[PDB]
Write a protein that binds this ligand. Sequence first.
Ligand SMILES: [Hg+2]
Ligand SMILES: [Hg+2]
Ligand SMILES: [Hg+2]
Ligand SMILES: [Hg+2]
Ligand SMILES: [Hg+2]
Ligand SMILES: [Hg+2]
Ligand SMILES: [Hg+2]
Ligand SMILES: [Hg+2]
Ligand SMILES: [Hg+2]
Ligand SMILES: [Hg+2]
Ligand SMILES: [Hg+2]
Ligand SMILES: [Hg+2]
Ligand SMILES: [Hg+2]
Ligand SMILES: [Hg+2]
Ligand SMILES: [Hg+2]
Lengths: 418, 418, 418
Amino acid sequence: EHCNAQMKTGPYKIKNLDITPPKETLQKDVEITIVETDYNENVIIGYKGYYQAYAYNGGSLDPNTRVEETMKTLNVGKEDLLMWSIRQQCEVGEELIDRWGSDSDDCFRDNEGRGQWVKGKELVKRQNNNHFAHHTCNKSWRCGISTSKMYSRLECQDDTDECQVYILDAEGNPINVTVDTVLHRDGVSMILKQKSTFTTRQIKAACLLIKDDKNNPESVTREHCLIDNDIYDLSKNTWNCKFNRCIKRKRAKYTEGDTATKGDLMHIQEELMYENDLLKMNIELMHAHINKLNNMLHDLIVSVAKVDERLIGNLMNNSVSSTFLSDDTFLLMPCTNPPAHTSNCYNNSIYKEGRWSSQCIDFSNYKELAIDDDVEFWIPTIGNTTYHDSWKDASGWSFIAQQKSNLITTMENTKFGG
Amino acid sequence: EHCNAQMKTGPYKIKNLDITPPKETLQKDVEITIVETDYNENVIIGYKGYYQAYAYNGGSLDPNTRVEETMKTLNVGKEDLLMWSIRQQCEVGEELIDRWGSDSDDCFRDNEGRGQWVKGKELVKRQNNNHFAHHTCNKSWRCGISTSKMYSRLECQDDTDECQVYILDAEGNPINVTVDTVLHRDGVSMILKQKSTFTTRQIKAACLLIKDDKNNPESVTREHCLIDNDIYDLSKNTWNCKFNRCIKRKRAKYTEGDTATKGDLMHIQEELMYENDLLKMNIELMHAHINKLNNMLHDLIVSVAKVDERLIGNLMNNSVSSTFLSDDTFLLMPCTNPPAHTSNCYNNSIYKEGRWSSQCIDFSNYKELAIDDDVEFWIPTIGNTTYHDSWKDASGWSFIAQQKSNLITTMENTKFGG
Amino acid sequence: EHCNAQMKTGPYKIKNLDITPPKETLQKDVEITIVETDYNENVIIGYKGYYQAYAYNGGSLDPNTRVEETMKTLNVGKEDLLMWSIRQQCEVGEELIDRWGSDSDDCFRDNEGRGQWVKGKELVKRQNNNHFAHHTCNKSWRCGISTSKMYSRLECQDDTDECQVYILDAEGNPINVTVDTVLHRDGVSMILKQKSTFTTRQIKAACLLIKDDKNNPESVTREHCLIDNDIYDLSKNTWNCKFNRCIKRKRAKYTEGDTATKGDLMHIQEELMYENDLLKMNIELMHAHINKLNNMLHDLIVSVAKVDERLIGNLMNNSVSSTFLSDDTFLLMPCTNPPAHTSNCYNNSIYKEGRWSSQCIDFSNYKELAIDDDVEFWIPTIGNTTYHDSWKDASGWSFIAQQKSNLITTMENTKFGG
Ligand SMILES: [Hg+2]
Ligand SMILES: [Hg+2]
Ligand SMILES: [Hg+2]
Ligand SMILES: [Hg+2]
Ligand SMILES: [Hg+2]
Ligand SMILES: [Hg+2]
Ligand SMILES: [Hg+2]
Ligand SMILES: [Hg+2]
Ligand SMILES: [Hg+2]
Ligand SMILES: [Hg+2]
Ligand SMILES: [Hg+2]
Ligand SMILES: [Hg+2]
Ligand SMILES: [Hg+2]
Ligand SMILES: [Hg+2]
Ligand SMILES: [Hg+2]
């Protein structure tokens, strides 16, 4: 307290800190529509066919000495296909081995394939022509039935809010498979067991809103919403559709079920690493600030303690009286007091410090004065996630792949039907 | 205030809190080089071949009675391959069915395959030998052309900062496919439409730096950098290369495009769950600390309010005067004041409290005194990510797979060419 | 200070803020058992077979004029299979081309395949019957050996804490492949080079514990544990097993190695986006609160500065004296003081302010009074992650796929063995 008076600077006033209105807003009870189908649908897959070798032996002289070979693949019709499913069995015609002479014609009798009921059956590539001056016939049948699964994809229109369940091939393209008409594709016959069925559900959900477009401080740049402890982006108010589900705030190749790459995982991993280090930086940046503030509160204490001998005791929550030596340093002595002071008189005529009989009140029943707000933080439990299969994993498509492969193998091992 | 004097402890001084210099540093304007190619490159894929059955019938007696079968796969040359691409068509020779007698030799006339232009064509495995004392020839042609895509992989050397675009097979290995020479592989002929072209881009980017090696408190253990609202690790100052892009702060199997596993997803999911719970713990740990501090500030208030009757009013931002009963408890009365006091005199001779005519100043124009720093938090918008296809999804490789399969099927259905 | 006395409200007391006991607890030195096997195991894969065409030519008259074709696939036995591995070679019988007449019987001599040692070998589908009144024999051999890899899966029982290493097929099912018995599957013979071996490791690890079930405030709803700078969920105290490793706090299709989808990646991406915006909201929500608190500390300052002229100087850490004009506004003058005051006397009789020779102490050696706690934040380094291959990538299964394909191709190109 010895100062140059000829240098008074001012007038001054303490700069209060900016209280910024939050750009991220929590909105409760946001109305949301969920539309969902079965992950996969039951598809009846059936195939049929025969390999035939009709031959005639007139010796080397005859131009009619030949072995005509055919491998017909047949379609299976709606009613048969259904029957096949019900029965977990498929129907073929009779196996004709070495039917020669006048029996050469058993071959042309049945081209639908009737009378044999098997679990399944594969061709045998049988052929012979060792009956001189005669025709020889061999005709082997193949057969297969499966009620397999194929992946659904739900889709809804923002125009009309109408939805449809698409059935996808191994590559993510929808395919025309219906309940009323058999589809013939990849050498096979396909029909739906069930008309594809969906369902809607209405909810009120908690959404985090973000308004960080400086030009449009009211435009909502991102919205994250809690659907059953799982987070979703619903910023765009178009229908949001993936796999078997569609969500909204009240035909080309689909792509979500494509196989993901290790490389994109690793980037998500780096993003996670980043988030962790981002958490640490900001937490510590906040830590440091508070500590600075804490220390200001210290400078406050030492100053006001020179007048208030019992303050340090209060702060430490233990009754002790302080005696200062400098502004900086001080001493402590133990104390304990009669705490039952509930009125403010005894035989009163301005008695105690800070100056303490209607001007004489008992304060047993008093109320808390709220001069502060507590902050409340919103960090809900998350992580109820679903994993979906890639589109190349459909049980139905591998079934189709299997019979295709089985045919390839049997049709290259020639058999003698004698 | 009744204390044991014989127990003075000290001298004491209030322990200030450690202000830790931040280990995570933000560095602005970090110079960065981006090198990028097309995700995929256009590859002309062409294939050709014939199946031939040259037979002679001299009866069972003749050892020369035989059916010689061959299936040649041919190479397609640079110029033809280009022509094929331009024309979306491929060229084959004439289809020879049942050419016997003196026409047996049509077979050997054309082995290049000229004169027929088709969109594409598959073999027919035709054969016969029913012309006694004569040779019989059948020769069927196959044909295919596609200008498909195959995935690029960029690579740069830290030595010399030279880059190259590699074209990968379905397994992630580079393959020698050039603009000047046709590559013959997997029974097919391949050439590039275009010389592989890249491009560079220089940027200044914001990077988060981390120095958490206790032994080397200056070594930078991790660096995360913002490239167009997407986060990258550039701690190592080697070239960072994935898929079609390379980044740097100014031949074996590649691996990023391998298919990722559900299991590694789930771990990333658990890491996310962890981060969320890590956020909650630390936020609340900070919450609690501040509340403790807030309550200290309360003990301060009650003490200094015994001298300052208008303080509580100021804090609550409403004019009220306080009267204390104990140290703890107090009463309130309403007030409102004339706020236009801009000088500090009236007819002044030490008038108001705290003691308030050159010693008499008007303070209309005053300045804010900055005794505090605001903290500033760095949490930029992220999430502009790219997804890449797995290496088994290249349109070009499935084309090659397709023709391979088509050949397999046709070469096991024998036809009679009579 | 002019107030309506007829409206005293009270008695009041300042509401302290709730200090909430943390629901997320850090527990150190949690005992954990790790069990681990090799990622993959060495599997000896061997295959063998022949294609035979035994024919007889008695002319068109003879019913015995026929070409009997067979393609046997053989099993390879334990000892041979081992020998094959050691030698990187496989054994076949002699190639018989056009052995006719009395040599027709070379065909039936050797059906095991002995005497030829090759790196590998493929069939040639050779056949002829151009020797009148004689049998003709052709028999070609195929051969293949690989010591390939197949993926391990570790599994442990909570009952008995016994573990086993399973060897998986391309679809994630375990297969019965042992050291003592050859397995015959997919037209091939398989045996283990090595008995499958695991190993255990005990650690003490730091775990984050969470108790957020309101009904059971002691139940531990989630536990995240650090295993070598990588985070794991060990809430459930069952064995946790994925791929080749099992962890615990002291046969159907396995699924972790299935291919993950782009769609599930994108959701993880949205979760990350969410976390970032969640970090920002909460950080800023905390920022705002502190600033409010900071400003309270300002109202405190101005009040107590009216009594303490040197306080503002202390806070700003520079010696200056304050003179007030209103309650709000003030002026500053420069100062600097003799700081060596280490006793509290000179020629003392109640000298300085706040009232400052055994009642006369030197304070060179004083101690810091801890009236505060620093908070300590726990954000450990993470991100030592492992990536695993999908189950369709096993070198051993593609080897099996390869020979299968090679056979398909050779068995549809007929050759004349004359
Ligand atoms: Hg005939
Ligand atoms: Hg006969
Ligand atoms: Hg006859
Ligand atoms: Hg990414
Ligand atoms: Hg009293
Ligand atoms: Hg000839
Ligand atoms: Hg003829
Ligand atoms: Hg002739
Ligand atoms: Hg991971
Ligand atoms: Hg006044
Ligand atoms: Hg015979
Ligand atoms: Hg002969
Ligand atoms: Hg002979
Ligand atoms: Hg997800
Ligand atoms: Hg002094």
